[PDB]
Write a protein that binds this ligand. Sequence first.
Ligand SMILES: CCCCCCCCCCCCC/C=C/[C@H](O)[C@H](N)CO
Ligand SMILES: CCCCCCCCCCCCC/C=C/[C@H](O)[C@H](N)CO
Lengths: 59, 235, 235, 227, 227, 55
Amino acid sequence: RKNTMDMYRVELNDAAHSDTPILCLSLSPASDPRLAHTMLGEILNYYTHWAGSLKFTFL
Amino acid sequence: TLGNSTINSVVAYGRWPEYIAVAACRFYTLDTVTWRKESRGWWWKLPDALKDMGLFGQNMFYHYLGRAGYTVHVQCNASKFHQGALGVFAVPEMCLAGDSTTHMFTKYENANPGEKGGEFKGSFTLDTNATNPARNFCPVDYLFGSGVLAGNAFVYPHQIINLRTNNCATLVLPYVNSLSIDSMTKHNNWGIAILPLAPLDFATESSTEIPITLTIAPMCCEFNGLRNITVPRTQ
Amino acid sequence: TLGNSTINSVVAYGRWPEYIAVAACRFYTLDTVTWRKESRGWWWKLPDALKDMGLFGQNMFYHYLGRAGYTVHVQCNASKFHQGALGVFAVPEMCLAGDSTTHMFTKYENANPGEKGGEFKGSFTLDTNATNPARNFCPVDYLFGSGVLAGNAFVYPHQIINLRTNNCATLVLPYVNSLSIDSMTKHNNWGIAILPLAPLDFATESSTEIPITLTIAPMCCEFNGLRNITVPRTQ
Amino acid sequence: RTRSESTVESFFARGACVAIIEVDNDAPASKLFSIWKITYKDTVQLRRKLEFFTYSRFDMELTFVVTSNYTDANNGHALNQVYQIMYIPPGAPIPGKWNDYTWQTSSNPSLFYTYGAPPARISVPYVGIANAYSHFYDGFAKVPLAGQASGDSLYGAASLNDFGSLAVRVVNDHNPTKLTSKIRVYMKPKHVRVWCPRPPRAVPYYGPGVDYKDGLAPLPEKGLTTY
Amino acid sequence: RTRSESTVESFFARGACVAIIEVDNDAPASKLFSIWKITYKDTVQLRRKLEFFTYSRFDMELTFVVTSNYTDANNGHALNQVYQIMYIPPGAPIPGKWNDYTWQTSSNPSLFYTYGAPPARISVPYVGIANAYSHFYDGFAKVPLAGQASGDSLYGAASLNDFGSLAVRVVNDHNPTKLTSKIRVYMKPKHVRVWCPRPPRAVPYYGPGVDYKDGLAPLPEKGLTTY
Amino acid sequence: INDSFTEGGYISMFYQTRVVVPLSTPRKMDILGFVSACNDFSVRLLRDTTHISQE
Ligand SMILES: CCCCCCCCCCCCC/C=C/[C@H](O)[C@H](N)CO
Ligand SMILES: CCCCCCCCCCCCC/C=C/[C@H](O)[C@H](N)CO
């Protein structure tokens, strides 16, 4: 999936309920490879220190 | 929103919870149960169901006296092509009938199952093992588990989840007791009973199952009598 | 009196503890140590020493961030025919020297012993086991365990227990840190060091031993960042 | 008699040597560029003065004294050298070669020094991520958790004293002759505030921590009843 | 916590290397003078920073760092060199020889730098013929017309980013010995205004346009359910 | 950068209930994630990035 459009899609299905996680992310907005190359991460990689709240939207 | 936890409503007896700890009292999600076509119903006891929930259980077992109201949120979604109805009842002093010829013979470990709770039965079975009795509840659904007609259970605070209309129920239960504060390990102030009023059905499928999830937040919590930790016997 | 716990005093740096939970923060008694003629000294770390103390330890391990001051009460009584003196020192960021040729090689389980703490040594011993290194502290008493002369330790907040004068010491330590609040499991804000300034003696007895008891109450406690429980690795 | 010269400001109002960074100007056994991690614990005098206290805030003044010499006699002459000193804050790409792209220093602060000029000098403010610098940290960066194999971080090591590095090179293309240069770094704290006095170091330093190995018997012999 | 260091001014307030112009001081295989067309697209760091936006206005500060060296050992000594840097705006005559009349620079701005002096520096205002600089131009300089043979201009190329060149020579008459010099050009935008933010470049640059050829798989592998 | 002392925490997603569809409906579907900073966000100490290099 990496380096295609499929890397942006997380698949859900209608299977029976389970307690397994759907996705897992580290709150490292500049060094986690999944957040580093977003606009936020790109801006952060020009600086050394960051502080403040984050917003995660899921569609 | 209560604490760091976030997300019609019925306030039991029109009385919001009130005071006569703070971090510990938040929404906790119990284990999901599976609504099938042949399901008879489920029950839980409060505060028993929350006894192993983070700091709230620690405060329960570290104090002699505790009191709390609750906010119970039942979640159950299906398609527009599903049908079925659930009744969610909050019963103060929800005593359940036993299974033996001996009165009040249900043991503590079975009367306090925890977040898993128990299930209603369709009929009454008498436990005959005398050497090793089960000493468990035998709650019959149409007797509402206590020798009363389930049709009249609607005198209790309640909500109805009709699959064609809504997918969630919210009950705000104030602390109800003959005392201002009691022992949370000796006494369950509330019981939650969920009965299928209309059986679950889905077109040309005798296999459909849908999950039901309960999320319960204690409210207006008070604890008193700090001592060493209580460790109830388990089975 | 702090909570249900009840009973000169020195306020470290003249600053009383202050805010930037409430039941959990009370006096707790650690295990008693035995002052002998040949004793070299004892040390503890705070909040490490209180990590298994009722609800305070639960709040420590359930939250990401915590802060607290302390009230430390050292208790040691003897007769009018005993002699000896103890120095009780409260050291912010009490780092102790290790035992190996590798810098900063002391492992987490040895740097956080708990309510038992550790003891000073009279001389420095270098751990030579390379296959299975001990990775423990080797604090020398006259070096105050950190490469400084113990005689100057009196620049820290301190009390002296002179057996002919007093039998107890009380230190009120405010929260001291470069941050407003930190991780209580990663970082020890305070260290307590007790050194025999004058050796214990009793007439014509080369056997006398007397107990020393520490009672510590956290104060002005704050916790933030409730999540699942932290379970540190043990040895 | 006033105490003007014993104020904390006056006590630290001196440029102290903290590093000698060595570089070479030679055709590519040599070191065409050097990386120095920024710290005051490579030397002893300033470290001992600072460790009188637990916490501190201050701005820092850095001065660079540059000296150079030929390696061989009558091997030839050389034109005046230019030196680049690039600050690499933690996370920025680190040079791996004398000529790699990182020296373009589009966002990194950089200093170009001409040999024979007066020592270079810059100032920086208090840059700590905490409210003060920690001279001592009694803790770990990671807490090892049950389930983890044999969270093994070093005792006392934390990123609260991670300030990046200095990368130093000679900008000139390499002479036919070999030249060696040393850049001495001098630190001066300014506008100093300090907290929690500690007893001074009594035995030789051993590593960046408080560990001791040798010279544990500092005090001499002196009779009790002898003046 | 203020955002003073993330303002557009602070983001670009750095001297970035954009060119290394090489010249020789030798008797007339050598290059006695060099022409460099003025652009920020020879390097990557400043280009990537600027291409966060579509349009910009700013003044420019140019700094010149000059280094030089002998080519042969013990070949002899040399007297201190003087360098001429002449700005040739588009249309002005371009030098064709080291000694041609154009170096008289009667109307062209010129800079004479003495070796060993601090790096040279000039400033220029916003000089765009449009109301802003265009980092991206989605068009052609010529529209090819029916009837024309096989108006063939390159895609994206327009004279709105034509700023002339720098001609660099050594003013001194040629030594008996060969000397090589490099002039590094550092750009700093000032009083910056920017418009229309764009996503940053994700793959290696390929030419002055937006074309890409290599390194098209930047992102690494990372499990979906792995922190 | 990745540093233990300044670690941020964990973001996770779970099924509260399951996803339910009727007949003649796709049983697999996609979600997409977006991230941004809030108005209290700030940064310090400008530095060069590791996301661009020149060869
Ligand atoms: C452009 C030429 C280089 C100029 C930039 C120099 C580096 C910037 C300063 C980084 C170092 C911060 C000051 C250090 C403070 C001490 O290490 C603390 N007391 C550590 O506890
Ligand atoms: C007399 C010594 C030489 C001094 C004169 C230097 C040349 C004058 C400046 C010409 C260059 C204009 C500034 C360039 C701006 C960027 O290229 C634009 N962002 C292009 O989009």
